[PDB]
Amino acid sequence: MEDEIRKAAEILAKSKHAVVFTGAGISAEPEEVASISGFKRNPRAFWEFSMEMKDKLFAEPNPAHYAIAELERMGIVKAVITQNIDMLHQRAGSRRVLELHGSMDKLDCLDCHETYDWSEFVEDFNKGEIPRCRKCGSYYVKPRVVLFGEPLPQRTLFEAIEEAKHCDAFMVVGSSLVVYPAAELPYIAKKAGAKMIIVNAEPTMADPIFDVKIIGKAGEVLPKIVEEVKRLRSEK
């Protein structure tokens, strides 16, 4: 994968406006669980599923997140578009992060419309006590996450589309590109003439559109790309 890593580094080093697009592949290491109809039928199932999933996710940022943060610090990466709700990009130091599917940070009771910060629930949550509305007692505390069957936040989606339309490099990391409308974004960048890079553990059905394809672990690949970019810029 070294020649591919070098090709990706060359693209990024020459770019005027690079964008990174991430999915669950960088964070890890259906209807009833993660959809709005599922949540309305049984919000406890969503929360019990989330308790199981938390154990499978990285508790803190990994080297892929730090590499992406460093590329922004270097002035290369202008935006991170993410499908993830775990805020690991921000915790790694990324600033320009577009959260297509929101995040767990803020929550609302669907019955009485009370608002919450995640900090209010996290202790109980880690003990397996599901979020309940303290005001009215409801089981319907919904995080400001886009569940399947919900539209995306309009401002965020617009900004992400604008990034895709006006970038000259677009790097997908840890996404199979099967969730829409998020998955439209790499096609928009491709149509706009951006150089297309993909980094994944496995192939995707979208692989044919990419100029550079890297199969590997993002935590290994992304730091190597950064080091090569620094070498091309005489920073290492």
Partner: peptide, 10 residues
Amino acid sequence: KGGAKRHRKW
């Protein structure tokens, strides 16, 4: 507005 968050094969 992009429709709903949804799964497709590609």
